[PDB]
JSON list of C-alpha atoms in Angstrom, two decimals:
[
{"chain": "P", "resi": 735, "resn": "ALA", "atom": "CA", "xyz": [33.26, 177.29, 88.48]},
{"chain": "P", "resi": 736, "resn": "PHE", "atom": "CA", "xyz": [34.13, 180.17, 84.49]},
{"chain": "P", "resi": 737, "resn": "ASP", "atom": "CA", "xyz": [36.89, 177.84, 83.35]},
{"chain": "P", "resi": 738, "resn": "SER", "atom": "CA", "xyz": [37.14, 178.05, 79.06]},
{"chain": "P", "resi": 739, "resn": "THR", "atom": "CA", "xyz": [37.80, 180.94, 77.06]},
{"chain": "P", "resi": 740, "resn": "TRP", "atom": "CA", "xyz": [35.08, 183.34, 75.76]},
{"chain": "P", "resi": 741, "resn": "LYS", "atom": "CA", "xyz": [35.28, 186.19, 72.68]},
{"chain": "P", "resi": 742, "resn": "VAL", "atom": "CA", "xyz": [32.85, 188.35, 72.62]},
{"chain": "P", "resi": 743, "resn": "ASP", "atom": "CA", "xyz": [29.61, 188.40, 70.36]},
{"chain": "P", "resi": 744, "resn": "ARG", "atom": "CA", "xyz": [27.81, 191.97, 71.37]},
{"chain": "P", "resi": 745, "resn": "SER", "atom": "CA", "xyz": [27.39, 194.81, 73.96]},
{"chain": "P", "resi": 746, "resn": "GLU", "atom": "CA", "xyz": [24.76, 196.18, 74.12]},
{"chain": "P", "resi": 747, "resn": "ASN", "atom": "CA", "xyz": [23.72, 199.64, 76.90]},
{"chain": "P", "resi": 748, "resn": "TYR", "atom": "CA", "xyz": [27.77, 199.73, 76.92]},
{"chain": "P", "resi": 749, "resn": "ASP", "atom": "CA", "xyz": [28.10, 203.74, 75.09]},
{"chain": "P", "resi": 750, "resn": "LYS", "atom": "CA", "xyz": [25.89, 204.94, 77.69]},
{"chain": "P", "resi": 751, "resn": "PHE", "atom": "CA", "xyz": [27.61, 203.09, 80.46]},
{"chain": "P", "resi": 752, "resn": "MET", "atom": "CA", "xyz": [31.08, 204.96, 79.46]},
{"chain": "P", "resi": 753, "resn": "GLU", "atom": "CA", "xyz": [29.21, 208.81, 79.15]},
{"chain": "P", "resi": 754, "resn": "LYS", "atom": "CA", "xyz": [28.12, 208.56, 82.79]},
{"chain": "P", "resi": 755, "resn": "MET", "atom": "CA", "xyz": [31.56, 207.09, 83.45]},
{"chain": "P", "resi": 756, "resn": "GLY", "atom": "CA", "xyz": [32.85, 210.55, 81.20]},
{"chain": "P", "resi": 757, "resn": "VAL", "atom": "CA", "xyz": [34.49, 209.59, 77.37]},
{"chain": "P", "resi": 758, "resn": "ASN", "atom": "CA", "xyz": [34.89, 211.10, 74.55]},
{"chain": "P", "resi": 759, "resn": "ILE", "atom": "CA", "xyz": [32.94, 210.24, 71.16]},
{"chain": "P", "resi": 760, "resn": "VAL", "atom": "CA", "xyz": [36.01, 207.79, 70.18]},
{"chain": "P", "resi": 761, "resn": "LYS", "atom": "CA", "xyz": [36.18, 205.45, 73.32]},
{"chain": "P", "resi": 762, "resn": "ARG", "atom": "CA", "xyz": [32.11, 205.01, 73.15]},
{"chain": "P", "resi": 763, "resn": "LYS", "atom": "CA", "xyz": [32.70, 203.07, 69.60]},
{"chain": "P", "resi": 764, "resn": "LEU", "atom": "CA", "xyz": [35.85, 201.29, 70.03]},
{"chain": "P", "resi": 765, "resn": "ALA", "atom": "CA", "xyz": [35.63, 199.43, 74.17]},
{"chain": "P", "resi": 766, "resn": "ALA", "atom": "CA", "xyz": [32.16, 198.55, 72.93]},
{"chain": "P", "resi": 767, "resn": "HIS", "atom": "CA", "xyz": [32.75, 196.74, 69.77]},
{"chain": "P", "resi": 768, "resn": "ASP", "atom": "CA", "xyz": [36.95, 195.82, 70.72]},
{"chain": "P", "resi": 769, "resn": "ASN", "atom": "CA", "xyz": [36.88, 192.62, 69.36]},
{"chain": "P", "resi": 770, "resn": "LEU", "atom": "CA", "xyz": [37.40, 190.48, 73.96]},
{"chain": "P", "resi": 771, "resn": "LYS", "atom": "CA", "xyz": [37.99, 187.65, 74.35]},
{"chain": "P", "resi": 772, "resn": "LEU", "atom": "CA", "xyz": [38.33, 186.14, 78.26]},
{"chain": "P", "resi": 773, "resn": "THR", "atom": "CA", "xyz": [40.74, 183.04, 79.31]},
{"chain": "P", "resi": 774, "resn": "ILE", "atom": "CA", "xyz": [39.69, 182.61, 82.25]},
{"chain": "P", "resi": 775, "resn": "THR", "atom": "CA", "xyz": [41.91, 179.68, 84.31]},
{"chain": "P", "resi": 776, "resn": "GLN", "atom": "CA", "xyz": [41.49, 179.26, 87.99]},
{"chain": "P", "resi": 777, "resn": "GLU", "atom": "CA", "xyz": [45.16, 177.80, 89.81]},
{"chain": "P", "resi": 778, "resn": "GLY", "atom": "CA", "xyz": [44.24, 177.70, 93.74]},
{"chain": "P", "resi": 779, "resn": "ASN", "atom": "CA", "xyz": [41.59, 180.27, 94.65]},
{"chain": "P", "resi": 780, "resn": "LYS", "atom": "CA", "xyz": [42.81, 182.47, 92.22]},
{"chain": "P", "resi": 781, "resn": "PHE", "atom": "CA", "xyz": [41.12, 183.37, 88.51]},
{"chain": "P", "resi": 782, "resn": "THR", "atom": "CA", "xyz": [44.35, 184.29, 86.34]},
{"chain": "P", "resi": 783, "resn": "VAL", "atom": "CA", "xyz": [41.64, 186.15, 83.60]},
{"chain": "P", "resi": 784, "resn": "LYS", "atom": "CA", "xyz": [42.86, 186.93, 80.67]},
{"chain": "P", "resi": 785, "resn": "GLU", "atom": "CA", "xyz": [41.68, 189.77, 78.96]},
{"chain": "P", "resi": 786, "resn": "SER", "atom": "CA", "xyz": [43.00, 189.83, 74.77]},
{"chain": "P", "resi": 787, "resn": "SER", "atom": "CA", "xyz": [41.37, 193.05, 72.95]},
{"chain": "P", "resi": 788, "resn": "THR", "atom": "CA", "xyz": [42.29, 195.67, 70.33]},
{"chain": "P", "resi": 789, "resn": "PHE", "atom": "CA", "xyz": [43.16, 198.27, 73.62]},
{"chain": "P", "resi": 790, "resn": "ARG", "atom": "CA", "xyz": [45.13, 196.10, 75.45]},
{"chain": "P", "resi": 791, "resn": "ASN", "atom": "CA", "xyz": [46.34, 192.25, 76.51]},
{"chain": "P", "resi": 792, "resn": "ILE", "atom": "CA", "xyz": [46.61, 191.36, 79.91]},
{"chain": "P", "resi": 793, "resn": "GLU", "atom": "CA", "xyz": [46.16, 188.96, 82.75]},
{"chain": "P", "resi": 794, "resn": "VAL", "atom": "CA", "xyz": [43.66, 189.51, 85.54]},
{"chain": "P", "resi": 795, "resn": "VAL", "atom": "CA", "xyz": [44.20, 187.36, 88.31]},
{"chain": "P", "resi": 796, "resn": "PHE", "atom": "CA", "xyz": [42.25, 187.91, 91.47]},
{"chain": "P", "resi": 797, "resn": "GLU", "atom": "CA", "xyz": [41.61, 186.32, 94.50]},
{"chain": "P", "resi": 798, "resn": "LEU", "atom": "CA", "xyz": [38.08, 186.08, 95.72]},
{"chain": "P", "resi": 799, "resn": "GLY", "atom": "CA", "xyz": [37.27, 188.68, 98.24]},
{"chain": "P", "resi": 800, "resn": "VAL", "atom": "CA", "xyz": [40.76, 191.13, 97.33]},
{"chain": "P", "resi": 801, "resn": "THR", "atom": "CA", "xyz": [40.21, 194.83, 96.32]},
{"chain": "P", "resi": 802, "resn": "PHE", "atom": "CA", "xyz": [41.77, 195.09, 92.68]},
{"chain": "P", "resi": 803, "resn": "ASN", "atom": "CA", "xyz": [41.56, 198.48, 90.36]},
{"chain": "P", "resi": 804, "resn": "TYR", "atom": "CA", "xyz": [39.68, 196.86, 87.38]},
{"chain": "P", "resi": 805, "resn": "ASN", "atom": "CA", "xyz": [41.02, 199.41, 84.64]},
{"chain": "P", "resi": 806, "resn": "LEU", "atom": "CA", "xyz": [38.08, 200.31, 81.64]},
{"chain": "P", "resi": 807, "resn": "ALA", "atom": "CA", "xyz": [40.90, 201.19, 78.62]},
{"chain": "P", "resi": 808, "resn": "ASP", "atom": "CA", "xyz": [39.81, 204.94, 78.16]},
{"chain": "P", "resi": 809, "resn": "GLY", "atom": "CA", "xyz": [40.14, 206.87, 82.04]},
{"chain": "P", "resi": 810, "resn": "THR", "atom": "CA", "xyz": [38.46, 205.05, 84.08]},
{"chain": "P", "resi": 811, "resn": "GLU", "atom": "CA", "xyz": [39.56, 202.43, 87.51]},
{"chain": "P", "resi": 812, "resn": "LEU", "atom": "CA", "xyz": [36.72, 200.10, 89.75]},
{"chain": "P", "resi": 813, "resn": "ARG", "atom": "CA", "xyz": [38.59, 199.62, 92.88]},
{"chain": "P", "resi": 814, "resn": "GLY", "atom": "CA", "xyz": [36.56, 196.25, 94.51]},
{"chain": "P", "resi": 815, "resn": "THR", "atom": "CA", "xyz": [35.54, 192.65, 94.25]},
{"chain": "P", "resi": 816, "resn": "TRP", "atom": "CA", "xyz": [34.54, 189.98, 92.62]},
{"chain": "P", "resi": 817, "resn": "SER", "atom": "CA", "xyz": [33.32, 187.15, 95.08]},
{"chain": "P", "resi": 818, "resn": "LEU", "atom": "CA", "xyz": [31.67, 183.50, 94.28]},
{"chain": "P", "resi": 819, "resn": "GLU", "atom": "CA", "xyz": [27.57, 183.65, 95.50]},
{"chain": "P", "resi": 820, "resn": "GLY", "atom": "CA", "xyz": [27.76, 179.40, 94.31]},
{"chain": "P", "resi": 821, "resn": "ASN", "atom": "CA", "xyz": [28.14, 178.96, 90.50]},
{"chain": "P", "resi": 822, "resn": "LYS", "atom": "CA", "xyz": [27.48, 183.99, 89.80]},
{"chain": "P", "resi": 823, "resn": "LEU", "atom": "CA", "xyz": [31.09, 186.00, 90.27]},
{"chain": "P", "resi": 824, "resn": "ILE", "atom": "CA", "xyz": [29.27, 189.01, 92.72]},
{"chain": "P", "resi": 825, "resn": "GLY", "atom": "CA", "xyz": [31.19, 192.19, 91.88]},
{"chain": "P", "resi": 826, "resn": "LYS", "atom": "CA", "xyz": [31.55, 195.18, 94.26]},
{"chain": "P", "resi": 827, "resn": "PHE", "atom": "CA", "xyz": [33.07, 198.26, 92.98]},
{"chain": "P", "resi": 828, "resn": "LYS", "atom": "CA", "xyz": [33.48, 201.40, 93.37]},
{"chain": "P", "resi": 829, "resn": "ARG", "atom": "CA", "xyz": [35.19, 204.61, 91.21]},
{"chain": "P", "resi": 830, "resn": "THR", "atom": "CA", "xyz": [38.59, 205.59, 92.63]},
{"chain": "P", "resi": 831, "resn": "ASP", "atom": "CA", "xyz": [38.11, 209.48, 91.31]},
{"chain": "P", "resi": 832, "resn": "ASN", "atom": "CA", "xyz": [33.96, 209.73, 90.89]},
{"chain": "P", "resi": 833, "resn": "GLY", "atom": "CA", "xyz": [33.61, 207.35, 94.11]},
{"chain": "P", "resi": 834, "resn": "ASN", "atom": "CA", "xyz": [30.48, 206.04, 93.34]},
{"chain": "P", "resi": 835, "resn": "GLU", "atom": "CA", "xyz": [29.33, 202.37, 93.31]},
{"chain": "P", "resi": 836, "resn": "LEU", "atom": "CA", "xyz": [29.17, 199.85, 90.53]},
{"chain": "P", "resi": 837, "resn": "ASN", "atom": "CA", "xyz": [27.09, 196.52, 91.37]},
{"chain": "P", "resi": 838, "resn": "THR", "atom": "CA", "xyz": [29.02, 193.79, 88.47]},
{"chain": "P", "resi": 839, "resn": "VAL", "atom": "CA", "xyz": [27.23, 190.33, 87.80]},
{"chain": "P", "resi": 840, "resn": "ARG", "atom": "CA", "xyz": [29.36, 187.71, 86.26]},
{"chain": "P", "resi": 841, "resn": "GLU", "atom": "CA", "xyz": [27.47, 184.53, 85.50]},
{"chain": "P", "resi": 842, "resn": "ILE", "atom": "CA", "xyz": [26.86, 182.24, 82.39]},
{"chain": "P", "resi": 843, "resn": "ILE", "atom": "CA", "xyz": [22.99, 181.54, 80.61]},
{"chain": "P", "resi": 844, "resn": "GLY", "atom": "CA", "xyz": [23.25, 178.29, 78.93]},
{"chain": "P", "resi": 845, "resn": "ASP", "atom": "CA", "xyz": [26.16, 179.17, 76.36]},
{"chain": "P", "resi": 846, "resn": "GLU", "atom": "CA", "xyz": [26.62, 182.70, 76.61]},
{"chain": "P", "resi": 847, "resn": "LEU", "atom": "CA", "xyz": [29.22, 184.27, 79.49]},
{"chain": "P", "resi": 848, "resn": "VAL", "atom": "CA", "xyz": [26.79, 187.77, 80.81]},
{"chain": "P", "resi": 849, "resn": "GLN", "atom": "CA", "xyz": [29.09, 190.83, 82.01]},
{"chain": "P", "resi": 850, "resn": "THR", "atom": "CA", "xyz": [26.11, 192.58, 83.84]},
{"chain": "P", "resi": 851, "resn": "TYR", "atom": "CA", "xyz": [27.30, 196.58, 84.68]},
{"chain": "P", "resi": 852, "resn": "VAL", "atom": "CA", "xyz": [25.33, 199.01, 86.66]},
{"chain": "P", "resi": 853, "resn": "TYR", "atom": "CA", "xyz": [26.70, 202.60, 87.15]},
{"chain": "P", "resi": 854, "resn": "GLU", "atom": "CA", "xyz": [24.29, 204.98, 87.71]},
{"chain": "P", "resi": 855, "resn": "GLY", "atom": "CA", "xyz": [20.99, 203.07, 87.15]},
{"chain": "P", "resi": 856, "resn": "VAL", "atom": "CA", "xyz": [22.58, 202.74, 83.83]},
{"chain": "P", "resi": 857, "resn": "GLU", "atom": "CA", "xyz": [23.12, 198.79, 82.91]},
{"chain": "P", "resi": 858, "resn": "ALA", "atom": "CA", "xyz": [25.62, 197.18, 79.82]},
{"chain": "P", "resi": 859, "resn": "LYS", "atom": "CA", "xyz": [25.87, 194.04, 79.38]},
{"chain": "P", "resi": 860, "resn": "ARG", "atom": "CA", "xyz": [29.00, 192.17, 77.41]},
{"chain": "P", "resi": 861, "resn": "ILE", "atom": "CA", "xyz": [27.76, 189.10, 76.29]},
{"chain": "P", "resi": 862, "resn": "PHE", "atom": "CA", "xyz": [30.92, 186.36, 75.25]},
{"chain": "P", "resi": 863, "resn": "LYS", "atom": "CA", "xyz": [29.96, 182.95, 73.60]},
{"chain": "P", "resi": 864, "resn": "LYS", "atom": "CA", "xyz": [32.41, 179.37, 74.15]},
{"chain": "P", "resi": 865, "resn": "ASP", "atom": "CA", "xyz": [35.14, 179.89, 71.72]}
]
């Protein structure tokens, strides 16, 4: 289901994830602590995800199974699919420029949305409370 406004409390291991992408010592500090709010709205199969932070305020409009570019706000695109396994969004993604695969799991732990991004064995969790 997912449909709600979700402000970031914490961003766990996101600095080492952005080192394995390949960034300078600016985007590691700023994009881990950018104040990201996810307003998720599903109109008819398509999820309209309004992503508002210090870097960018944009709506990611995706149907379940469509291959799209997810942009990190640095110099890094991920091409792939958020698909719904019952109540969990399984993200089958890969890099445009490296070619390397990325598994990302969106799920609610009670009253907090975890987006669990695994790149090169390195797991990063951006954790958003209901707010």
